[PDB]
Amino acid sequence: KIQIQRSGHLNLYLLLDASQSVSENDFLIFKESASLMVDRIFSFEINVSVAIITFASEPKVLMSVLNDNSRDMTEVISSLENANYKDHENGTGTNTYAALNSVYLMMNNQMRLLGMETMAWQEIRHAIILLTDGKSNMGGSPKTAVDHIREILNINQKRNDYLDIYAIGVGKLDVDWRELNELGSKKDGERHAFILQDTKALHQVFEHMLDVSKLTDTICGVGNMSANASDQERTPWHVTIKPTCRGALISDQWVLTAAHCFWRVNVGDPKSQWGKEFLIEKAVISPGFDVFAKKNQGILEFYGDDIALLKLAQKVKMSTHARPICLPCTMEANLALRRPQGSTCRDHENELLNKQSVPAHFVALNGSKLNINLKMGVEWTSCAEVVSQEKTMFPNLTDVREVVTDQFLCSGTQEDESPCKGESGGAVFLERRFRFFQVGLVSWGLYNPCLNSRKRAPRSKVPPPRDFHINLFRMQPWLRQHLGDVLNFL
Numbered sequence: 328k329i330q331i332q333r334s335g336h337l338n339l340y341l342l343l344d345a346s347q348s349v350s351e352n353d354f355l356i357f358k359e360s361a362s363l364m365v366d367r368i369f370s371f372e373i374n375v376s377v378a379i380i381t382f383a384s385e386p387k388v389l390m391s392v393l394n395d396n397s398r399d400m401t402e403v404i405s406s407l408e409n410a411n412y413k414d415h416e417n418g419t420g421t422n423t424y425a426a427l428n429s430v431y432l433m434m435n436n437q438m439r440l441l442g443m444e445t446m447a448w449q450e451i452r453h454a455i456i457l458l459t460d461g462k463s464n465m466g467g468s469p470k471t472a473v474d475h476i477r478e479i480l481n482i483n484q485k486r487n488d489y490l491d492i493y494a495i496g497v498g499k500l501d502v503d504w505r506e507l508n509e510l511g512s513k514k515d516g517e518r519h520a521f522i523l524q525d526t527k528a529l530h531q532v533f534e535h536m537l538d539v540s541k542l543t544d545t546i547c548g549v550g551n552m553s554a555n556a557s558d559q560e561r562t563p564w565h566v567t568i569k570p571t572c573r574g575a576l577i578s579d580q581w582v583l584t585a586a587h588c589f590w591r592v593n594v595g596d597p598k599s600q601w602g603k604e605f606l607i608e609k610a611v612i613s614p615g616f617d618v619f620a621k622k623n624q625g626i627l628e629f630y631g632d633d634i635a636l637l638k639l640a641q642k643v644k645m646s647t648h649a650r651p652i653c654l655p656c657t658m659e660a661n662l663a664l665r666r667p668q669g670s671t672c673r674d675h676e677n678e679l680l681n682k683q684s685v686p687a688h689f690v691a692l693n694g695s696k697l698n699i700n701l702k703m704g705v706e707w708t709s710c711a712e713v714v715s716q717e718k719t720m721f722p723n724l725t726d727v728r729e730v731v732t733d734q735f736l737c738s739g740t741q742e743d744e745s746p747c748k749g750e751s752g753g754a755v756f757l758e759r760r761f762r763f764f765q766v767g768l769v770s771w772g773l774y775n776p777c778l779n780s781r782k783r784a785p786r787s788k789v790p791p792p793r794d795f796h797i798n799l800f801r802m803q804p805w806l807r808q809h810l811g812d813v814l815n816f817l
């Protein structure tokens with residue numbers, strides 16, 4: 328597997344077959360797949376260098392791991408996009424040996440430059456990925472180059488983790504499965520050769536090529552993108568609160584949730600679907616919250632300041648099953664988003680919520696990730712306005728803003744899912760650059776589909792479903808009052 332961890336360094340070498348048996352359109356699919364793998368690899372904030380080599384009769388090195396630009400995601404993707412298939416027009420045979428020997432030469436050059444005996448050289452783990460149809464037909468057996476690489480890298484039983492070779496035929500093309508299998512590593516309990524229809528399928532397989540099991544620091548907003556992973560692996564910030572409500576881990580000891588929920592907190596755990604129970608040291612409930620604040624004047628429930636923090640009695644161990652989500656307006660989120668150093672909270676709100684309709688998610692009672700569209704600007708006004716049909720909860724509503732204040736994000740239109748009562752307090756979040764950011768938390772709505780089964784409202788069912796989520800960008804003074812020494816705010 329390709330290991331994602333803090334200690335050491337990862338060199339990834341991407342070998343793209345530009346031989347005649349691969350059409351220009353196939354090659355574009357190779358470039359698309361390579362770009363995704365680069366984007367994903369850079370999402371973990373680990374120490375990684377990427378080489379890019381295209382090959383047919385002879386290899387062409389577009390990016391070397393000796394070059395400092397190989398550690399810069401933008402330079403890497405650019406060398407990739409600047410890769411032309413026609414640069415191999417006069418040698419269109421398939422010399423897989425020579426492509427692999429190009430990697431060998433690079434390894435030789437690097438070892439020389441760093442020193443065989445140094446930890447700078449010995450700490451590097453090497454992952455080679457060939458995108459090819461596996462139809463080598465010149466240059467001799469690739470095994471010679473494989474064996475040279477195993478030798479220079481001193482791959483023994485103790486150093487088996489220092490080398491992985493993958494051969495992947497992605498696209499509609501005709502592939503020789505036997506050569507792919509022969510090229511790939513042979514490791515017990517793992518596969519190193521794949522035949523995949525498209526980049527979409529590659530994205531799924533790549534998640535299973537990565538071993539993130541030893542990434543146990545507090546890195547935020549990291550999850551699993553595989554449809555085959557567990558719910559908790561997909562959303563490891565997710566917690567259940569038994570006072571039922573949901574919440575989000577925002578550090579290794581603090582949980583963000585809704586005030587209206589108010590004990591045990593159930594946190595992800597790699598050892599069972601059942602999670603791990605935590606007790607609470609301290610709860611901090613917003614003093615503004617009073618659900619009956621407006622009751623005497625005909626707004627029977629009011630959710631202004633619906634926010635709470637829980638400090639757990641012990642620290643959570645970070646794992647594939649338990650991690651903080653990223654909060655906007657922090658330095659950690661700024662880095663995840665790859666934005667300028669001096670960015671402000673306003674900049675993060677612009678970064679994340681720029682469109683009039685922003686695809687977002689919340690987590691269901693059963694752990695499933697569900698979809699919503701947050702409506703911004705003019706569409707926020709139309710989204711929120713339908714509360715004026717809710718005459719039973721709001722018999723005395725003179726202005727929409729008496730119940731749907733600027734503290735709330737809005738969703739629930741068209742084909743959106745709508746949170747259930749027990750989903751309250753859970754994160755409303757978005758994915759950007761393969762990282763997850765909490766922009767709000769589930770507070771209230773006009774329709775409870777659960778009042779694994781959710782009912783849709785009838786199209787006639789006045790008022791229609793509509794959902795209102797405390798907006799984290801509107802709660803900064805309170806969050807900062809309480810978490811100033813927990814998180815690193817911009």
Ligand SMILES: *[C@@H]1O[C@H](CO)[C@@H](O[C@@H]2O[C@H](CO)[C@@H](O)[C@H](O)[C@H]2NC(C)=O)[C@H](O[C@@H]2O[C@H](CO)[C@@H](O)[C@H](O)[C@H]2NC(C)=O)[C@H]1NC(C)=O
Pocket residue numbers: 623624625723724725
């Ligand atoms: C219906 O809702 C409106 C809007 O909030 C209330 O009227 C508001 O009352 C505030 C002070 O409470 C006042 O400063 C606003 O000018 C006024 N807004 C509007 C648009 O009129 C109603 O509150 C009731 O109505 C009177 C007349 O305004 C208030 O003076 C009074 O305090 C209040 N009645 C009581 C004793 O509850 C509200 N209607 C009801 C029946 O609650």
Ligand SMILES: *[C@@H]1O[C@H](CO)[C@@H](O[C@@H]2O[C@H](CO)[C@@H](O[C@@H]3O[C@H](CO)[C@@H](O)[C@H](O)[C@H]3NC(C)=O)[C@H](O)[C@H]2NC(C)=O)[C@H](O)[C@H]1NC(C)=O
Pocket residue numbers: 328515516534535536537538539540550551552553555556557560647
């Ligand atoms: C998305 O979640 C997947 C499902 O959990 C992850 O795939 C799992 O990765 C694990 C770590 O590499 C594998 O763990 C085991 O490691 C031991 C010892 O190091 C091996 O001996 C075992 O063979 C292996 N598990 C066993 C007992 O077979 C899991 O095998 C593996 N599961 C599957 C279905 O592939 C993905 O890594 C994860 N991806 C991301 C990006 O988070």
Ligand SMILES: *[C@@H]1O[C@H](CO)[C@@H](O)[C@H](O)[C@H]1NC(C)=O
Pocket residue numbers: 413414415416417
């Ligand atoms: C292919 O060979 C021709 C003739 O020598 C040459 O003019 C052309 O530039 C070559 N193409 C590439 C990509 O080098």
Ligand SMILES: *[C@@H]1O[C@H](CO)[C@@H](O)[C@H](O)[C@H]1NC(C)=O
Pocket residue numbers: 691693694695779780781
């Ligand atoms: C979880 O709930 C979703 C949403 O209704 C549903 O599609 C899915 O089938 C459920 N998962 C399980 C385990 O049944």
Ligand SMILES: [Mg+2]
Pocket residue numbers: 344346347348349420421462463
């Ligand atoms: Mg070929």
